[PDB]
RNA sequence: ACGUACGACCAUACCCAGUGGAAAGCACGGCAUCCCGUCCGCUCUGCCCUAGUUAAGCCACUGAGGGCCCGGUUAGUAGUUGGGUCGGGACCAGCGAAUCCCGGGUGUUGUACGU
RNA sequence: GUCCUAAGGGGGGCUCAUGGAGAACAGAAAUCUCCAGUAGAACAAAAGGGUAAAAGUCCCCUUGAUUUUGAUUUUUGU
RNA sequence: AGCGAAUGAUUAGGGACUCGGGGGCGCCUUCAUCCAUUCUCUGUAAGAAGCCCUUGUUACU
């Protein structure tokens, strides 16, 4: 229970901008993600066509990026400043992951370039404990123990203890 | 062979349409000098107890 | 339906040509060995 | 046979010319598969190739038998236990006859079918017989 | 026009006959002018060959084959086929652009005819074509036969 | 509200093989590795199995039978402490030394050790052992095939370091130079100097030099036992060369592991002392009766 | 006997929950210069075996667990092969099951190196 | 008259259909994350057989989709 | 070999409707168009031509 190998850690933070249309808007959204993260973002195509969404199959409609390490903690804490360290209880998943979404990227500290415009973001934080390599490695891949899996209540407690957040 | 269309209505008609058809057809047989066209393809099937009560009351 | 007769030595006609050629060379060698 | 992976001791069995093999067709491997007939048939190996063997089968047509030579991969052939009862027996007769000739006493060395049993005595003590009716009395209850 | 036909005719709520008619019309328009279509829309329409309707399947395969002979670069590496990938790898297939006209500086098969003439001269010794010698009709027939043989060898 | 894992699912479930459920064996590659031509009959097919752990390298010569595999010879990385290498037992040079040791051991076991002596001074060149000029005639080199297991065979992996060590020991392993840690994919030319540097462990040496120049704290954190045993960056080449010389001199040295030492019988006794046992059926019936009494009380 | 590597049968081995692990070995682990690969050193690859911890993997035990496997019975029954100048199914001569129920069990083992 | 009668080989990586829980606009459906998932996907038989570090999908090279000679099966030549 | 929620119906109530058609005086309409809705899962073996030992031949391994 109090083992040093049971500490909750941020496995990754995934940043998503789903524009819903291809072209210059998606290019500028990818520029926003590249400027925020420091890495090359990856584009996401539509896997099937919807008529009244205005999208078609094999059309790039979204962009996303994954950050790990202290950079993920920094960007997540900036987003938590934007959300004023207040998340509703439904934002925490049953497996112990969480996430939220901002409506504009200027509040993270990015300057407003008139060429780029206004884009919002989806932040998703995936949490692990040390020992996830058991399920992610190639040779002798196994399953994480039930006592080692993260609980939604443990994630909520970790959030309220580290970030001084108000889960309500 | 089993088929789903054996258990469906094969001919349906609305109340006002049936009433208008019956009225027009009756007006047509009113005149004996008028003959129909393609009568075999027309829905002509739509056009074409005191003792019991007393015995029921008193056997 | 009687069982058909079977030859004492089956032909090398069915076997693979590499082993057939090696077997023919071996038969020539044992023939010269017997002749000696 | 269970779906999925094939056991790998199939490839480690060594077949030679003259060996007796069954044909049990594996559904998973389609290469080297024989006909619909010649499945479940026992034959003689005449040719041994890298991944397949040649099997001599005697098919029947009309009122005669025709020799057929069938090329079957090692997936579908299995060693046949028809002549193990011959090889073990002939070895056993070889050493037993050598030992009996060395010792001097002749023996019966041919296998014999089931003879009638000899006379013996059965004791009644602690095994007293019970009397049975044509129907059980607890059943008639 | 192609975008409107694709939006109104081939979609999730569209009927199979409507989708087949739209894809056939799109195939005919692409036959007349291939540059009207974008590569993403082309790959989307070619992926309709996995549809369970036979008419839509054949229409999508017709569009795919049409772009296979015409312009295979938009088509996916899975859907290009043998000859298209071989031509694109060896470098014979060139991009088709608006306004390009055939600009053969020499006759087709003239190099093959010159090679055949050189082979005949070498055989005679053992026993430039358009620049000096006038085109004999038998020589033109031999050049056409050599061009057909070269096309058959390239197909093989 | 549906249940995927129900009784019908558990009844229709067909498991994989045990060593595939454990994630240790690739049977698709194993079939090709162990399948021998039936024209060749009972000719053994030797495979050099290489495996890597956190603190050891496991190299074996393996043949296949019906009821199990046979280890003809085996060499481990921790046995290089007898030959001098007591630091960095999982690096590329230790992999090379373990492959060399396994090759020398299998050649000594076969008896062809003096007939087939490979490259005595490693140079870093793509070479394969050929037929030796025996007095009787031409003797072909002993042939083995590499088995990497579930390892990713990229450029610079130690699965090829073990293979290079065995090939320089004298075993004929069919191989190509494109997966050695000096090969450039664009140039398609192997860098002999870089390959020799990896053989003699110069990459670790320049790693220590770079950290000694740049980050002293991380250098002391990582290479602490190197400092404690006072082995330097420039001495690695001589250390590995002397280790190669001792391996070629006496390939059957015995190494004391410094672990607690006992015999098989009292190790068995200790393991049964530290072993809880299954309940007897009388005890399990007593506990089932206790559970039935608890259910009756409830 | 217990680990590791390669394995043979391929659930008595799988799935879900708990409890414990001497010794060493595995394992999580620590660092991204080199070889290498990624949107991300997550995986893969390279280097360290120092530190921490058995928390997870792994092993063992527990469960009136689901599943799976093996025995009795079911049953000399059902079924089936011949016979009668047997009746309007029963005998004679023989072969001969599987469910349902009642229970048991929850892996054996080869080679090599070690604890 | 147009259109369709199907891209094969080698190596490597990864699992599919679907369900549950979550993320600004975003909802039943657009993209992202985790868990469960014996094939319930896909492979040109719509409820046949066979496939999960693959026979599926993606990436990198390639056309063994090449000549020549016999044997076998379906049964004189095919 | 054929069938198949890849099916068969429902559309009263809501809309879009407009030239879809038609009527009356560019304007309204009367039908009708559809859409939104919903319902329906028998082979082989039982030997002297067979077994065991020794020994050669080979371009195969």
Curated annotation (Swiss-Prot), chain A:
Component of the ribosome, a large ribonucleoprotein complex responsible for the synthesis of proteins in the cell. The small ribosomal subunit (SSU) binds messenger RNAs (mRNAs) and translates the encoded message by selecting cognate aminoacyl-transfer RNA (tRNA) molecules. The large subunit (LSU) contains the ribosomal catalytic site termed the peptidyl transferase center (PTC), which catalyzes the formation of peptide bonds, thereby polymerizing the amino acids delivered by tRNAs into a polypeptide chain. Keywords: Ribonucleoprotein, Ribosomal protein. It comes from the Eukaryota. Belongs to the universal ribosomal protein uL5 family. InterPro entries: Ribosomal_uL5 (IPR002132), Ribosomal_uL5_C (IPR031309), Ribosomal_uL5_CS (IPR020929), Ribosomal_uL5_dom_sf (IPR022803), Ribosomal_uL5_N (IPR031310). NCBIfam families: PRK04219.1. One of its GO terms (molecular function) is structural constituent of ribosome. This is Large ribosomal subunit protein uL5. GO terms for cellular component: ribonucleoprotein complex; ribosome. SUPFAM superfamilies: RL5-like. Signal peptide: none annotated. GO terms for biological process: translation. Component of a hexameric 5S RNP precursor complex, composed of 5S RNA, RRS1, RPF2, RPL5, RPL11 and SYO1; this complex acts as a precursor for ribosome assembly. It holds the Pfam family Ribosomal_L5_C.
From Swiss-Prot, chain E:
Required for 60S pre-ribosomal subunits export to the cytoplasm. May also be required for 60S ribosomal subunit maturation and accumulation. Belongs to the SDA1 family. Associated with the 60S pre-ribosomal particles. The gene is SDA1. The chain holds residues 385 to 646 of 767 of the full protein. It is found in: Nucleus, Nucleolus. It comes from the Eukaryota. It comes from Chaetomium thermophilum (strain DSM 1495 / CBS 144.50 / IMI 039719) (Thermochaetoides thermophila). This is Protein SDA1.
Swiss-Prot record, chain F:
Keywords: Cytoplasm, Ribonucleoprotein, Ribosomal protein. GO terms for cellular component: cytosolic large ribosomal subunit. It is found in: Cytoplasm. GO terms for molecular function: 5S rRNA binding; structural constituent of ribosome. One of its GO terms (biological process) is translation. The keyword Nucleotide-binding does not apply. This is Large ribosomal subunit protein uL18. It comes from Chaetomium thermophilum (strain DSM 1495 / CBS 144.50 / IMI 039719) (Thermochaetoides thermophila).
